Design a binder for this molecule. Structure first.
Ligand SMILES: OCCCn1nnc2c(Br)c(Br)c(Br)c(Br)c21
Ligand SMILES: [Cl-]
Length: 325
């Protein structure tokens, strides 16, 4: 299996570009920054609102928890490669604790409004507008030979007042190389593509497009998350109940994918559902023929038949956004 697009991007560039293990970051001093407030925390980091003491600017400091330095080099190099990218969070600095040498990444501040509150009040145009902005970031990183691999609402910062969007947390991102087998333990359960859920390691940029399709569905239909699995097994069941079981098996046959025998107990028999089935009185104003056509071309089992970010950007759904400029 080969990506349709940007497939040989990294092989045509200097080894230096993608060989992140040989990257040597310049680590500044964290003394330049004053921590103000904890914003969040995960497995790999804790994130703080901070002030740059010299220019008085508000920033975000991500303090990295004990992981192998390889993964830190990967994230830092990916961010350097994506610098100036449209709607990619800007890395301002890479600094270390002056006593423990704990590394930290410093990012631009975005006045984010959490998706739970935001997604309930988005208009049809808002959804089109923000999906377009997010697609700009995905086309950009894919064009730079990079898969994000953790596209989800929590990783998309939206300033709804200034209409700014940033794709954040590149800690799971990886360089795409044709025929390389990747770890399927990436992305968050609700946004994992079928390829991950059936342990298919030869995936590519199209993984991110499945995740974006999941977001689009949650926004236009107001079921968030759209596919709400209780575990990784049930996640695929939720998907197959909509996309259909025979279509799943057709996908597995095409790529010679072996299905975990535990799926025999739980997968059942389900016909493909019409997307119009998810329309009701509270989401009618967000759904259009154009929106359903785009969604149908994103949420496909066949990772090679999903729209690329660029093809999705060119879809009629986004015409009102392009006209407004
Ligand atoms: O790149 C790692 C992302 C971690 N992360 N978590 N919460 C964040 C908020 Br709120 C803002 Br605002 C920004 Br800016 C970032 Br960054 C945040
Ligand atoms: Cl990997």
């Amino acid at each position: 299996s080969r990506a349709r697009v940007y497939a040989e991007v990294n092989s045509l560039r200097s080894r230096e570009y993608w060989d992140y293990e040989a990257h040597v970051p310049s680590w500044g001093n964290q003394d330049d920054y004053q921590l103000v407030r904890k914003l969040g925390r995960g497995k790999y980091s804790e994130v703080f609102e901070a002030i740059n003491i010299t220019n008085n600017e508000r920033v975000v400091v991500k303090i990295l928890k004990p992981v192998k330095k390889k993964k830190i080099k990967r994230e830092v190099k990916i961010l350097e490669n994506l610098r100036g990218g449209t709607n990619i969070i800007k890395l301002i600095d890479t600094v270390k604790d002056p006593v423990s040498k704990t590394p930290a990444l410093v990012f631009e501040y975005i006045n984010n409004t959490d998706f739970k509150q935001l997604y309930q009040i988005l208009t049809d145009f808002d959804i089109r507008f923000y999906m377009y902005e997010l697609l700009k970031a995905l086309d950009y990183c894919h064009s730079k030979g990079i898969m994000h691999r953790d596209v989800k609402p929590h990783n998309v910062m939206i300033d709804h007042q200034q209409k700014k969007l940033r794709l954040i947390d590149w800690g799971l991102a990886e360089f795409y190389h044709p025929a390389q087998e990747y770890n399927v333990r990436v992305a968050s359960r609700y946004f994992k593509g079928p390829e991950l859920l059936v342990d298919y390691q030869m995936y590519d940029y199209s993984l991110d497009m499945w995740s974006l399709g999941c977001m689009l569905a949650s926004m236009i239909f107001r079921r968030e998350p759209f596919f709400h699995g209780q575990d990784n097994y049930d996640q695929l069941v939720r998907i197959a109940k909509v996309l259909g079981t025979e279509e799943l098996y057709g996908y597995l046959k095409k790529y010679h994918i072996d299905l975990d025998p535990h799926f025999n107990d739980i997968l059942g028999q389900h016909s493909r559902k019409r997307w119009e089935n998810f329309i009701h009185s509270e989401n009618r104003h967000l759904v259009s023929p154009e929106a359903l056509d785009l969604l149908d071309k994103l949420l496909r089992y066949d990772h090679q038949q999903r729209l690329t970010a660029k093809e999705a950007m060119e879809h009629p759904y986004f015409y009102p956004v392009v006209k407004e400029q």
